[PDB]
Amino acid sequence: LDQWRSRQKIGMGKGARCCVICSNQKALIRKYELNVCRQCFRENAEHIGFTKLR
Amino acid sequence: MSTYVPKPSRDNVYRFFFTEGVIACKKDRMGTWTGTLGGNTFTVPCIQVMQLMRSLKSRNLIKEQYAWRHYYWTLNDEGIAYMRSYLHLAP
Amino acid sequence: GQTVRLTITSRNAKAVESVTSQLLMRARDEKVTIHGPVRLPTRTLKITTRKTPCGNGTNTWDTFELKIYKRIIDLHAPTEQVKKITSFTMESGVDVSITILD
Amino acid sequence: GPLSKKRMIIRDGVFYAELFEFLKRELAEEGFSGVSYHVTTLRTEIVIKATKTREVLGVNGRRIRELTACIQQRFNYKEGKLQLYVERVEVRGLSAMAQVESLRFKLLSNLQVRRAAMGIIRYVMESGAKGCEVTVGGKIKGQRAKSMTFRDGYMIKSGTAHKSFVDSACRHCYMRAGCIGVKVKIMLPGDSTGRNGPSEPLPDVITVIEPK
RNA sequence: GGAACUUUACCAGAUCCGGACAGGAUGAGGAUUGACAGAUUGAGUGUUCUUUCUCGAUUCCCUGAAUGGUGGUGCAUGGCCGCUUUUGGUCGGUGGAGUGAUUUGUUUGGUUGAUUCCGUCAACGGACGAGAUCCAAGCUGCCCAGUAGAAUUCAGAAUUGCCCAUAGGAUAGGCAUUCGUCGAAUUCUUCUCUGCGGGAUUCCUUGUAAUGCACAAGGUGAAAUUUUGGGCAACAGCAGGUCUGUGAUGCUCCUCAAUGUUCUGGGCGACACGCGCACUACAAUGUCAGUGAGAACAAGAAAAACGAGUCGAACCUACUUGAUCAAAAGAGUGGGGAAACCCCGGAAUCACAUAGACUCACUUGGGACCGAGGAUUGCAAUUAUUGGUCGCGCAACGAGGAAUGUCUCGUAGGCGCAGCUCAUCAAACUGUGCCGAUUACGUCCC
Numbered sequence: 001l002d003q004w005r006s007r008q009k010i011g012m013g014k015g016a017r018c019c020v021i022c023s024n025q026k027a028l029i030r031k032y033e034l035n036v037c038r039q040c041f042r043e044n045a046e047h048i049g050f051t052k053l054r
Numbered sequence: 055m056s057t058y059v060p061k062p063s064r065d066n067v068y069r070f071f072f073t074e075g076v077i078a079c080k081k082d083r084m085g086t087w088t089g090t091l092g093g094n095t096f097t098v099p100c101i102q103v104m105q106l107m108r109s110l111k112s113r114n115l116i117k118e119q120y121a122w123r124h125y126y127w128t129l130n131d132e133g134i135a136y137m138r139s140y141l142h143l144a145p
Numbered sequence: 146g147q148t149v150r151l152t153i154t155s156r157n158a159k160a161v162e163s164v165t166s167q168l169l170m171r172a173r174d175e176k177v178t179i180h181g182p183v184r185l186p187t188r189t190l191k192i193t194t195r196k197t198p199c200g201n202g203t204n205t206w207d208t209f210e211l212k213i214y215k216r217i218i219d220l221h222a223p224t225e226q227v228k229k230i231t232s233f234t235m236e237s238g239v240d241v242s243i244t245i246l247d
Numbered sequence: 248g249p250l251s252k253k254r255m256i257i258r259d260g261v262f263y264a265e266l267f268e269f270l271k272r273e274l275a276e277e278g279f280s281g282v283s284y285h286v287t288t289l290r291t292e293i294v295i296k297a298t299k300t301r302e303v304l305g306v307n308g309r310r311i312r313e314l315t316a317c318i319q320q321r322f323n324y325k326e327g328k329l330q331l332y333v334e335r336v337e338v339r340g341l342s343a344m345a346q347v348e349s350l351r352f353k354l355l356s357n358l359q360v361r362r363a364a365m366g367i368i369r370y371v372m373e374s375g376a377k378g379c380e381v382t383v384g385g386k387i388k389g390q391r392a393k394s395m396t397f398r399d400g401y402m403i404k405s406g407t408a409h410k411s412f413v414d415s416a417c418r419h420c421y422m423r424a425g426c427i428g429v430k431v432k433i434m435l436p437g438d439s440t441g442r443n444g445p446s447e448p449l450p451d452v453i454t455v456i457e458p459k
Numbered sequence: 460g461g462a463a464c465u466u467u468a469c470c471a472g473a474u475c476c477g478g479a480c481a482g483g484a485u486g487a488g489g490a491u492u493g494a495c496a497g498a499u500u501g502a503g504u505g506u507u508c509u510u511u512c513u514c515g516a517u518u519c520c521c522u523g524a525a526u527g528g529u530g531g532u533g534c535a536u537g538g539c540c541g542c543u544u545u546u547g548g549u550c551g552g553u554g555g556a557g558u559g560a561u562u563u564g565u566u567u568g569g570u571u572g573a574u575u576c577c578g579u580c581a582a583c584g585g586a587c588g589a590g591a592u593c594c595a596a597g598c599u600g601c602c603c604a605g606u607a608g609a610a611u612u613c614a615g616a617a618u619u620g621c622c623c624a625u626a627g628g629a630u631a632g633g634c635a636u637u638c639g640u641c642g643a644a645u646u647c648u649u650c651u652c653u654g655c656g657g658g659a660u661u662c663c664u665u666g667u668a669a670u671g672c673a674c675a676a677g678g679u680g681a682a683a684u685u686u687u688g689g690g691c692a693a694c695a696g697c698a699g700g701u702c703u704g705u706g707a708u709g710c711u712c713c714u715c716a717a718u719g720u721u722c723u724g725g726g727c728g729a730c731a732c733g734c735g736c737a738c739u740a741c742a743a744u745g746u747c748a749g750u751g752a753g754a755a756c757a758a759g760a761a762a763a764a765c766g767a768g769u770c771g772a773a774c775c776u777a778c779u780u781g782a783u784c785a786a787a788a789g790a791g792u793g794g795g796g797a798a799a800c801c802c803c804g805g806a807a808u809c810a811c812a813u814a815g816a817c818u819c820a821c822u823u824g825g826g827a828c829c830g831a832g833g834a835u836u837g838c839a840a841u842u843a844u845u846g847g848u849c850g851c852g853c854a855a856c857g858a859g860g861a862a863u864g865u866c867u868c869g870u871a872g873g874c875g876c877a878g879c880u881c882a883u884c885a886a887a888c889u890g891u892g893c894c895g896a897u898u899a900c901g902u903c904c905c
């Protein structure tokens with residue numbers, strides 16, 4: 001029966017969110033509605049445009 | 055959903071995939087896929103497009119590369135010649 | 146006048162001046178009576194993550210920044226004369242925006 | 248509704264970051280070397296830098312045709328909005344991203360690790376580079392992993408000016424016994440126009456001028 | 460890593476295949492999909508058994524396989540990080556030395572934070588690290604503003620003097636002053652914003668040193684010695700951490716009652732106890748109740764969805780209301796894509812001649828513990844999500860044993876505020892401002 005992903009249909013939680021690069025749902029940067037995982041961002045900060053000035 | 059793909063969907067996905075040549079589909083297993091034959095009316099779920107293409111690649115008909123969260127599937131020289139027989143088209 | 150405001154926004158500091166000074170040097174040739182290019186405050190964008198992908202070590206951090214450069218120019222030309230000022234192939238990464246004031 | 252200017256610099260960065268990852272995976276054996284995209288009304292430009300322009304283009308453009316519509320179907324562009332081009336790198340020896348993908352194939356074709364890496368550095372240093380550094384790390388010799396670096400010429404590393412002068416790219420080589428990672432760093436020589444290398448000299452070179 | 464579900468990796472169950480593709484036997488005279496009512500069940504879960512219709516080659520049954528795993532091994536690896544190390548260190552070439560490992564360069568002398576420099580010198584020429592470059596703060600030029608502000612001049616309005624608080628001190632003084640007054644004008648860049656640029660160099664001065672490299676004191680100045688504060692950092696290495704970040708990975712385990720994946724319910728949070736780290740205090744340099752003056756960094760709404768290629772609603776917010784009567788709410792109505800609205804950002808320490816209560820007590824200190832209403836977040840509040848109201852306060856705690864941590868100026872300490880986690884929740888962390896010291900400017904004792 002299609003009770004199949006009934007908890008993942010409603011999208012309120014930490015499981016509904018996801019790293020858009022790296023498919024993980026642990027420790028994502030949601031500031032500026034960025035939605036990249038913590039580790040998968042530092043690999044990609046230069047292409048997004050962030051550079052560590054200080 | 056279900057990887058049980060209906061026959062009116064499979065030929066409708068193949069009609070798009072021979073025409074444009076490529077299908078890009080998100081890895082989201084609760085979301086749809088939308089393609090266009092002028093009417094943009096497919097609303098095929100993404101679960102079934104993965105199943106259709108995993109059957110194709112196992113028959114070594116397509117070339118798959120995967121970006122961040124999107125698949126990108128392309129027809130081959132054998133794959134175009136195979137796709138024409140399923141849709142019954144002139145070369 | 147129609148008082149069209151062009152918004153020059155960019156991520157590069159050297160590309161936002163090479164558009165604005167070029168866009169201004171166009172709008173002197175038709176004698177448009179511009180109100181000069183003002184420098185709106187640059188907005189820096191901080192994401193301060195950990196450095197480690199694991200958990201251990203000294204808890205070190207690294208702040209990333211991203212500055213948005215922002216310029217506006219007001220000019221009294223009609224709406225197809227400002228498209229003469231606007232139309233030139235710019236540098237990549239500079240957004241221009243045409244807005245009509247009142 | 249429109250997003251704020253702060254919200255649009257984000258989505259324009261994540262656009263370029265995702266576009267860069269797709270072409271890095273596709274065009275690895277086409278010698279891919281970067282993207283620049285130019286957006287305006289009526290068309291969105293994408294220029295692809297490569298070393299093998301007969302291969303990133305198809306027989307009649309077939310390869311870039313498929314590679315166009317992969318970007319179109321993903322990012323929901325409409326017909327006429329998205330046009331792609333291919334430009335070639337003029338030097339091929341000053342592009343660290345191209346040389347590391349070739350060094351990836353020199354190992355995957357079962358050649359010797361040190362013979363492959365000096366073949367890069369001979370080719371990079373004859374191409375006018377001021378210096379080069381190849382690091383191969385992994386299970387080179389046996390069960391336990393080693394690291395070897397191979398060096399020639401100058402190499403600036405501690406400044407924040409090394410982002411301007413040193414070109415770097417790291418890929419993974421998937422051996423039969425494990426995983427090897429290769430790195431290639433190339434110090435850009437010259438090219439005051441910005442063809443490959445900065446206009447200004449190094450931050451500590453003084454170069455007093457001679458009087459007339 | 461602030462987990463209610465999810466997250467999730469754990470436990471008790473229950474589904475689903477997301478076992479592709481091959482090869483072999485059933486197969487359209489049907490391979491099979493799905494489900495109403497009952498029984499089964501935790502389940503108005505077709506999971507299954509009864510019942511019969513739908514689906515129409517997608518499947519299913521065997522065999523071989525393959526793909527999934529937050530399964531294992533970080534002592535098989537890549538990558539990144541940490542740490543050796545806040546240190547001044549490493550490397551060739553060619554010459555010299557030695558049978559050789561190896562030396563020399565790379566140094567005994569002064570000097571600097573610095574193998575930083577000067578001098579010497581069997582070495583001479585180079586490369587990296589250091590310095591430089593980069594960011595931020597302080598003073599400043601040009602440019603600049605119906606997204607920043609200012610003055611003026613006419614009009615409009617307000618006070619206008621004889622006034623000495625109940626007991627009433629200290630303290631500036633041609634044309635008096637004040638401004639949703641949601642006024643008109645007409646001149647400006649003083650402050651504001653900011654792209655590139657000036658300015659600082661031991662520059663000048665007179666003891667240390669004695670050629671030199673430099674040093675101390677003072678000048679100059681906005682700034683005086685790496686100007687301040689950070690970023691970046693070589694070469695080697697650790698059998699440090701991460702296979703719980705990845706569609707990073709090799710090997711190996713599990714692989715249809717699966718260690719896959721989803722539901723449902725628990726758990727991660729359970730308390731004789733031992734420790735790290737905060738928070739709150741032990742009060743009168745205070746608690747309370749008033750009243751005043753008054754910050755900086757910042758955030759802010761949505762999709763190929765559902766609605767009217769364009770527009771709405773999700774986000775933050777002022778303002779009214781609720782209000783012929785508690786908070787917390789709940790509602791209207793505006794505005795804002797964020798220098799344009801919040802906003803003249805009314806932070807909290809502080810302040811006050813407030814003629815305010817307490818008066819040295821476990822007390823009006825402290826607010827742990829828990830009782831009873833109530834209202835919001837959520838699909839769900841029980842093992843109180845959170846706020847607010849009245850109780851409890853008879854819970855230690857009166858300044859802390861042996862020990863121990865951080866710090867040299869807008870600093871320590873105190874004080875709050877943003878952002879980040881976030882539907883709801885900060886005793887956290889990343890930032891920012893406010894108030895603002897004691898001591899040293901030394902040494903090798905540990």
Ligand SMILES: NC[C@@H]1O[C@H](O[C@H]2[C@@H](O)[C@H](O[C@@H]3[C@@H](O)[C@H](N)C[C@H](N)[C@H]3O[C@H]3O[C@H](CO)[C@@H](O)[C@H](O)[C@H]3N)O[C@@H]2CO)[C@H](N)[C@@H](O)[C@@H]1O
Nearest residue numbers: 544545546547572573589590685687688689692866867870
């Ligand atoms: N990259 C700078 C490094 O500074 C090192 O030297 C540093 C040390 O001698 C010394 O650093 C000390 C540090 O040792 C000790 N553990 C703590 C002390 N606060 C530091 O002091 C330094 O930093 C702080 C800035 O917050 C200042 O108070 C002080 O002026 C400064 N001397 O001061 C120097 C920093 O200016 C080394 N010379 C070298 O590793 C390197 O050059």
Ligand SMILES: [Mg+2]
Nearest residue numbers: 030031032033
């Ligand atoms: Mg948000």
Ligand SMILES: [Mg+2]
Nearest residue numbers: 308311331332
């Ligand atoms: Mg073409």
Ligand SMILES: [Mg+2]
Nearest residue numbers: 552553554555
């Ligand atoms: Mg020798």
Ligand SMILES: [Mg+2]
Nearest residue numbers: 859860861862
């Ligand atoms: Mg004791």
